[PDB]
Design goal:
Structural class: alpha+beta
Strand content: 35-45%
Distance between the termini: 10 Å
Subcellular location: Cytoplasm
Helix content: 10-25%
Subunit structure: Interacts with CXADR. Interacts with MAGEB18 and MAGEF1. Interacts with the phosphotyrosine interaction domain of all isoforms of NUMB. IGSF5/JAM4 interacts with isoform 2 through the second PDZ domain, other isoforms may also interact with IGSF5/JAM4.
CATH architecture: Roll
CATH superfamily: PDZ domain
Radius of gyration: 12 Å
PDB class: peptide binding protein
Organism: Mus musculus
CATH class: Mainly Beta
Number of domains: 1
Shape: globular
Protein name: E3 ubiquitin-protein ligase LNX
Largest sheet: 6 strands, antiparallel
Order of helices and strands: EEEHEEHE
């Protein structure tokens, strides 16, 4: 796994990542990265990356709903632990 730090300019700003579940395996995955958004401009995240944790909260067997809630909860800093096949 590897670390990605994204910073929100405002607490309500979205990261520009659509997170999804999969029918046949556990995990929270990136479906797409929105052009010009925070994640896109940072440049590291790719489609199909798995989000393993956000700000120290484990998402290995978590949901995109929990991920969204955690992203929103942070005032600015979003520390993602990510894996890529």
């Amino acid at each position: 796994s590897f670390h990605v730090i994204l910073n929100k300019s405002s607490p309500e700003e979205q990261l520009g990542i659509k997170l999804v579940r999969r029918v046949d395996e556990p995990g929270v995955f990136i479906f797409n990265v929105l052009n010009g958004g925070v994640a896109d401009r940072h440049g590291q995240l790719e489609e199909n990356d798995r989000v393993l944790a956000i700000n120290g909260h484990d998402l290995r067997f978590g949901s995109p709903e929990s991920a969204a809630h955690l992203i929103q909860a942070s005032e600015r800093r979003v520390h993602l632990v990510v894996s890529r096949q």
